[PDB]
Amino acid sequence: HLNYRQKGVIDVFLHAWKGYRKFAWGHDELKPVSRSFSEWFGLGLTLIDALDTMWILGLRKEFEEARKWVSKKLHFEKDVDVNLFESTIRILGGLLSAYHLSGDSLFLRKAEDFGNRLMPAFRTPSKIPYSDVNIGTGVAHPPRWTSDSTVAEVTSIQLEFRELSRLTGDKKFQEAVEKVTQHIHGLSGKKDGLVPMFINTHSGLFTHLGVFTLGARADSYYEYLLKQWIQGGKQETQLLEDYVEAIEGVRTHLLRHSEPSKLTFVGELAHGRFSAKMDHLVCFLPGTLALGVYHGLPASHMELAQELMETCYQMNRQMETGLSPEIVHFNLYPQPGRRDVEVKPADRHNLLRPETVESLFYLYRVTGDRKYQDWGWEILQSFSRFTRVPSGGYSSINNVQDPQKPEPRDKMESFFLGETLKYLFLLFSDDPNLLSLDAYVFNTEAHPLPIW
């Protein structure tokens, strides 16, 4: 049943996992070069993020060992501040997917415990949640570096809280996140469906007006408009309307073409001024566009999806290591001697992020064009060649443009095993019934949830 490239993904997962087991078991993140670990939640983050990946890959003895850790060692009462968004997409989503795939009620019981501890974040005058909540003390607060919550953060928790309410029969989770969605539906200050990056919890209004990105702090707002619509059985038309409007806004304001290859890319807008800067995070968008087309969105979305998938591929393959940097810049006009994909010296790191292989999965599932599998295999071979740590694990690197000295940062992010390897395994599968597009939607940390 497993094909050659899938066996390759499993090889990579188990080399990653033996570093995690040997040097970071029960801890949030492996630091593979130093053979140690780091904590920021203190909640076995990498383990929880990889539960469903282990199940999907057939790694059942490993899953059972991880299940025993959740049963005995996972406890939520420590005095620790957590980011509501990261907690929700990683830990709440990871537990809910582990429940659905395994059927083991332990994961749901941990999910409900955790969900309850996140609820104080929503006690704001506007009901738009605070950014941070202490799962042990019950205090929630805004960040220190800014007074506002982040738009993607308060709009990328809905799938998880909705599903938790459906499974527990406790309406408070769904009611809290749906208030956020309805309120933002009615806010002023969008540009043709494009949202600002920040939102004030006291006034409920957008801040940082006139500055529009589809990268960090805005990207998954658009992703979850579509995915919530799919999740709820395509009856919540306001979600679809705001999604359709947003894609037209992307077309009108953010799309330009590179030189020399005329690649379609998405840039940023600040107070009317275009910037040809594209986070690797924006590479979520071709996958989301294609997912929409599978579910009835117009064919123009697939035209755009295929152009952007090619661009995102080139963001990887035009680098010396074959791995995309964190941020790329594009030239609107010809520059002698330059490739399409420019990268600032400070932006040359790769943190093993999943968004290109994320989108290849959907492009393959919807089109059947096997070149998207070939491109994913190419990217995985680059990960193997430049980020592998002999003792175990894989590391973020500081320089995708120096194949002799990529400069490991000594960290394996939980989304390498939660997302990057999961999307690759699915991309290579010969089975369209494996986590079918008709039956599940993935949350923004690649944790599948059932369509209602």
Contact segment (CB under 5 A) with La ion among 161-169, 185-193, 253-261, 438-446 equals: 438-446
Tell me how far apart the alpha carbons of residues 121 and 58 are, in angstroms, rounded to a whole number: 37
Q: Is 413 a catalytic residue?
A: no
Torsions phi, psi of 231, nearest 5?
-55, -45
Considering the candidates 307, 355, 358, 413, report the single residue annotated as catalytic: 355
- Using CA atoms, how far residue 448 sits from 25, 98, 109, 379, 405, in Å, is 24, 9, 18, 23, 37
Contact segment (CB under 5 A) with La ion among 2-10, 192-200, 402-410, 436-444 equals: 436-444
State which residue, 87 or 444, has the beta carbon closest to La ion.
Answer: 444
State which residue, 264 or 444, has the beta carbon closest to La ion.
Answer: 444
State which residue, 83 or 444, has the beta carbon closest to La ion.
Answer: 444
Tell me how far apart the alpha carbons of residues 2 and 21 are, in angstroms, rounded to a whole number: 25
CB 158, min distance to La ion, A: 14
The answer for residues whose C-beta is within 8 angstroms of residue 341's C-beta and 6 or more apart is 314, 315, 318, 319, 328, 330
Task: Give the x-and-dash track for 35-74 against La ion (CB under 5 A).
Answer: ----------------------------------------
Number of residues that bind La ion (CB under 5 A): 1
For residue 444, say whether it is annotated as part of any ligand binding site.
yes
Length of the chain: 452
Instruction: Considering only the C-alpha atoms of the chain, give the largest distance between any 2 of them, rounded to a whole number of Å.
Output: 62
CB 288, min distance to La ion, A: 10
Tell me how far apart the alpha carbons of residues 231 and 254 are, in angstroms, rounded to a whole number: 28
Contact segment (CB under 5 A) with La ion among 163-171, 311-319, 366-374, 441-449 equals: 441-449
Residue 228 lies near La ion (rule: CB under 5 A): no
State which residue, 356 or 444, has the beta carbon closest to La ion.
Answer: 444
CB 125, min distance to La ion, A: 29
* Contact indicator for 324, 400 with CB cutoff of 8 Å: yes
Closest-CA residue to 52 (of 431, 448, 428, 406): 448
Residue nearest to La ion (CB): 444
CB 422, min distance to La ion, A: 12
Considering the candidates 39, 86, 320, 407, report the single residue annotated as catalytic: 86
Tokens of residue 351, six digits: 């943190």
Task: Give the x-and-dash track for 390-429 against La ion (CB under 5 A).
Answer: ----------------------------------------
Q: Is 86 a catalytic residue?
A: yes
Residue 444 lies near La ion (rule: CB under 5 A): yes
The answer for residues whose C-beta is within 8 angstroms of residue 346's C-beta and 6 or more apart is none
Considering the candidates 49, 219, 242, 419, report the single residue annotated as catalytic: 219
State which residue, 74 or 357, has the beta carbon closest to La ion.
Answer: 357
* Contact indicator for 174, 161 with CB cutoff of 8 Å: yes
State which residue, 86 or 175, has the beta carbon closest to La ion.
Answer: 86
CB 446, min distance to La ion, A: 8
Applying the rule CB under 5 A, the residues between 75 and 114 that interact with La ion are none
- For residue 125, whether the previous peptide bond is cis, meaning omega lies within 30 degrees of 0, is no
State which residue, 198 or 442, has the beta carbon closest to La ion.
Answer: 442
CB 337, min distance to La ion, A: 35
CB 77, min distance to La ion, A: 29
The answer for residues whose C-beta is within 8 angstroms of residue 336's C-beta and 6 or more apart is none
Bridge partners of residue 206, in order along the sequence: 199
Q: Is 175 a catalytic residue?
A: no
Applying the rule CB under 5 A, the residues between 287 and 316 that interact with La ion are none
Considering the candidates 62, 326, 413, 419, report the single residue annotated as catalytic: 326
State which residue, 89 or 95, has the beta carbon closest to La ion.
Answer: 89
Contact segment (CB under 5 A) with La ion among 323-331, 366-374, 389-397, 443-451 equals: 443-451
Sign, CA torsion 177/183/186/188: negative
Tokens of residue 303, six digits: 């035209």
Applying the rule CB under 5 A, the residues between 347 and 366 that interact with La ion are none
At CA 266, angle to CA 295 and CA 416, rounded to 5?
A: 70
- Using CA atoms, how far residue 54 sits from 14, 17, 404, in Å, is 10, 10, 32
Contact segment (CB under 5 A) with La ion among 169-177, 301-309, 343-351, 439-447 equals: 439-447
The distance from CA 35 to its chain's CA centroid, rounded to whole angstroms, is: 26
Q: Is 65 a catalytic residue?
A: no
Tell me how far apart the alpha carbons of residues 154 and 121 are, in angstroms, rounded to a whole number: 10
CB 71, min distance to La ion, A: 29
Q: Which helix (H) or strand (E) holds 11?
A: helix 4-23
Closest-CA residue to 302 (of 13, 227, 310): 310
Q: Which amino acid would we find at residue 432?
A: P
Q: Strand, coil or helix: what is 266?
A: strand
Catalytic positions are: 86, 219, 326, 355
| Residue set of the binding site for Ca(2+) | 444
**Which positions touch La ion (CB under 5 A)?**
444
The annotated binding site is made up of 444
